[PDB]
């Protein structure tokens, strides 16, 4: 049919989506969560501070054991940090120094890297020779790599700077499934606890849920008014929080198909760089461009606490699987552990 | 106390020493950023010396690192901040673009966006006006006023080139902090690298004086 007819059909479907969304708006999260007691002031201290890096830190990820973490910086080095003792387990000399993302395999055997260069590098931590080396170079992407997350020891899903998100196979090193739903740049990813679905944030203020196996969009959320820099899954896997440059964080529910609550405040005019959840999901820790990190109560949507142990932008924010401690990287080249 | 963790601490200290050596090496090297519409001009600039393309060349016992971002074709707002520490930025625009399809206006828009960027507040810009030889003939054939209706002057290479230089320079709102080193180059032999080296040395002097507190 003609383009105008297709646009009319799209508008009618959009109106139907609006009607469906409003029909399910029984109540807001605030009035229902008013029945629970406020979390109260949350005080955290910097038990451990890491000064190994010499350049700006941009991404980090916690391991399954809740002991080892991997950090990435533009100096071109990946450092596996022993949180308890601060020892440097490994130091990977990156081929490309322009790295803005990293990931840790669930089993700890492999790590991921990516950034301005479109190639994705996977390193073997448990090689016989004892020296970490590159296993594969996934260069199928055309745009700059934005985020990477390990689904298993053989499958990895990464989001690039182009409009396409790809699922990769370590055994063959080819794009098994490619996602092209997003129209703008894709910033961050987040794997569900069941490792079956994942949400991707994009610069077009659109959050879309993808099926790892089926490989098509399942839901779309458009509650933000700017680019979505960060996204993370709820511990129970039925919700996720979105961080955006418009100085507001929104929690989306997969069943309700709409935002439940908005985290924003008048003094906070800066953007959000990273977002993470605690083990229980009660506390939402989100990074901010100002020299501090704010802890938000996911239910009551209030500033439980503020971490002002940084003097530069808080690029990344990682939380241990068991919730023992929270790691907050920043551009000051120092990584700190909070609990 | 520790029994075997002391070996891990020793390994960590050795890794830290290697990291310090690498950081010193990186600090000694000077980083340069390449920008400009059109692959031909940037290719000519590179020869006169898949994502990011890195070119390494040493001039007068100084190691120069140049980064290519044209091939990325992505929104600059999401990755331009990565180049905060670049000592200087090289902008390449062909003077002949004024008659092709509007390209000069796009180059001016890109220069205005880069020069007024918050991240590049304290980074100098080196402007290279490429294809002077082609501009010589284009002025003789096409007038400069096609893309600049406000322009009014003699149709000569000197006047038109000077007018282009002023037009590009006035876009710098931060005139107190930024310094634009405009230059003319078509196929200069051991002259372009001298100019870029001089500009980088001046930027290094400015940074050193700022560090010492005089600036």
């Amino acid at each position: 049919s003609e383009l105008d007819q297709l646009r009319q059909e799209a508008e009618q479907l959009k109106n139907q989506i609006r009607d469906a969304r409003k029909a399910c708006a029984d109540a807001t999260l605030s009035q229902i969560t008013n029945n629970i007691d406020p979390v109260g002031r949350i005080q955290m201290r910097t038990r451990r501070t890491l000064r190994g890096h010499l350049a700006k830190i941009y991404a980090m990820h916690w391991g399954t054991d809740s002991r080892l973490l991997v950090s990435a910086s533009q100096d071109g080095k990946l450092i596996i940090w022993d949180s308890y003792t601060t020892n440097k387990v490994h130091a990977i000399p990156l081929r490309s120094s322009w790295v803005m993302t990293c990931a840790y395999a669930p089993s700890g055997n492999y790590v991921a890297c990516g950034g301005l260069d479109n190639i994705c590098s996977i390193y073997n931590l448990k090689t016989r020779e004892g020296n970490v080396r590159v296993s594969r170079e996934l260069a199928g992407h055309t745009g700059y790599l934005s985020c990477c997350r390990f689904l298993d020891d053989n499958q990895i899903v990464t989001s690039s700077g182009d409009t396409t998100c790809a699922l990769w196979d370590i055994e063959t090193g080819q794009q098994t499934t490619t996602f092209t739903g997003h129209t703008g740049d894709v910033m961050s990813l987040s794997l569900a606890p069941d490792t079956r679905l994942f949400v991707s944030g994009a610069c077009d203020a659109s959050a879309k849920l993808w099926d790892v196996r089926e490989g098509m969009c399942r839901q779309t959320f458009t509650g933000h008014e700017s680019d979505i820099n960060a996204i993370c899954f709820f511990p129970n896997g039925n919700a996720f929080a979105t961080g955006s440059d418009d100085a507001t964080c929104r929690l989306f529910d997969l069943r309700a198909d709409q935002e439940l609550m908005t985290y924003s405040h008048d003094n906070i005019i800066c953007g959000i760089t990273s977002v993470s959840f605690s083990k229980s999901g009660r506390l939402l820790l989100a990074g901010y461009d100002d020299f501090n990190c704010n802890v938000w109560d996911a239910l009551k949507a209030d500033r439980a606490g503020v971490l002002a142990g940084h003097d530069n932008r808080v690029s990344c924010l990682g939380v241990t699987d068991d919730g023992m401690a929270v790691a907050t990287g920043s551009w000051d080249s120092f990584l700190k552990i909070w609990n | 106390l520790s029994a075997e963790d002391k070996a891990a601490v020793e390994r960590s200290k050795m890794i830290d020493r290697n990291l310090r050596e690498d950081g010193e090496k990186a600090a000694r090297e000077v980083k340069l950023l390449l920008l400009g519409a059109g692959e031909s001009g940037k290719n000519t600039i590179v020869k006169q010396m898949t994502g990011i393309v890195e070119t390494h060349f040493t001039f007068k016992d100084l190691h120069f690192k140049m980064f290519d971002v044209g091939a990325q074709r992505s929104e600059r707002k999401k990755w331009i901040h990565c180049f905060e520490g670049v000592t200087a930025i090289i902008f390449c625009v062909a003077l002949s673009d004024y008659d092709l399809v509007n390209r000069m206006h796009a180059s001016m828009k890109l220069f205005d966006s880069i020069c007024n960027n918050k991240w590049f507040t304290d980074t100098s810009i080196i402007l290279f006006l490429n294809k002077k030889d082609l501009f010589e003939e284009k002025i003789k054939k096409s007038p400069l006023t096609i893309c600049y209706p406000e322009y009014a002057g003699s149709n000569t290479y000197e006047e038109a080139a000077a007018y282009i230089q002023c037009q590009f320079e006035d876009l710098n709102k931060r005139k107190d902090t930024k310094e634009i080193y405009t230059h003319f180059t078509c196929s200069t032999d051991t002259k372009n690298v001298q100019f870029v080296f001089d500009a980088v040395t001046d930027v290094i002097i400015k940074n050193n004086l700022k560090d010492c507190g005089l600036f």
């Epitope: 387990v89 490994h90 016989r128 004892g130 | 106390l1 029994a3 075997e4 891990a8 020793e10 390994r11």
Partner: single-chain antibody, 233 residues
Framework: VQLVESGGGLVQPGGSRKLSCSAS????????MHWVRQAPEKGLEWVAY????????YYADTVKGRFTISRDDPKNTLFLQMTSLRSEDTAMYYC??????????????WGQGTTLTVSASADIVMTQATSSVPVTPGESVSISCRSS???????????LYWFLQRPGQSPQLLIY???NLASGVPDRFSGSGSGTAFTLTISRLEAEDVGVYYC?????????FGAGTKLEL
């Protein structure tokens, strides 16, 4: 990964020799070395240890000062120099690589070793309960040992390693830290302990398991070793 060693022979008492080993297939500089000696009838015994950075060099009490250990990372070769060796030194020496980090597997690889012949306290003691136990294919056997001091460090890691010396070849690491199996070791092996009493379980015994089983403690130097338990098929 190979470790070729040379420098054996027969020498009269009071002489001096320099054992040498060539390391290939792995990063020698990143791996710390150890030296272990086999008496003709007795068990393994540690000699010396040089770290990756050539620092924190340690020697056993019976060889302190008399022997020295040096390494050349650029040449990827290890030299052990022996001076004024006595009759008690007659043994077969093995070179062992080691790497120290969380999750590491030190003493995973052992060299073939060289034969050396001479013509005519304050350490943890490995009290092996038994010296020899008969076994049959398809059966299960438990090997237990006693330690003077509990190896359970305050960090929760007990420093207990197990080694198997099949006849005609060097020892092979099986379990390290009594809870992790070395690479290439069948999963049927299992170990457990309470920090002072240890037991090694070998389910579904296979003919390739014949040999002498040796213990190791790494809590405090010197790395004293047990008598060794031999299994006969």
């Amino acid at each position: 990964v190979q470790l070729v060693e040379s420098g054996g022979g027969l020498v009269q008492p009071g002489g001096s020799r320099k054992l040498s080993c060539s390391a290939s297939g792995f990063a020698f500089s990143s791996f710390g070395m150890h030296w272990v000696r086999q008496a003709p009838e007795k068990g393994l015994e540690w000699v010396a240890y040089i770290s990756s950075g050539s620092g924190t060099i340690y020697y056993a009490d019976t060889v302190k000062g008399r022997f020295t250990i040096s390494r050349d990372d650029p040449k990827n070769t290890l030299f052990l120099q022996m001076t004024s060796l006595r009759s008690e030194d007659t043994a077969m020496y093995y070179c062992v690589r080691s790497i120290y980090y969380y999750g590491s597997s030190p003493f995973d690889f052992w060299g073939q070793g060289t034969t050396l012949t001479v013509s005519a306290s304050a350490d943890i003691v490995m009290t092996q309960a038994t010296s020899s136990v008969p076994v049959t294919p398809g059966e299960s056997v438990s090997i237990s040992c006693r330690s003077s001091k509990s190896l359970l460090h305050s960090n929760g890691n007990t420093y207990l390693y197990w080694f198997l010396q099949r006849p005609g070849q060097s020892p092979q690491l099986l379990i390290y830290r009594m809870s992790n199996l070395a690479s290439g070791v069948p999963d049927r092996f299992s170990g457990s302990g309470s920090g002072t009493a240890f037991t090694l379980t070998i389910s579904r015994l296979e003919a390739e398991d014949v040999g002498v089983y040796y213990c190791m403690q790494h809590l405090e130097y010197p790395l004293t070793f047990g008598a060794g338990t031999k299994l006969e098929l």
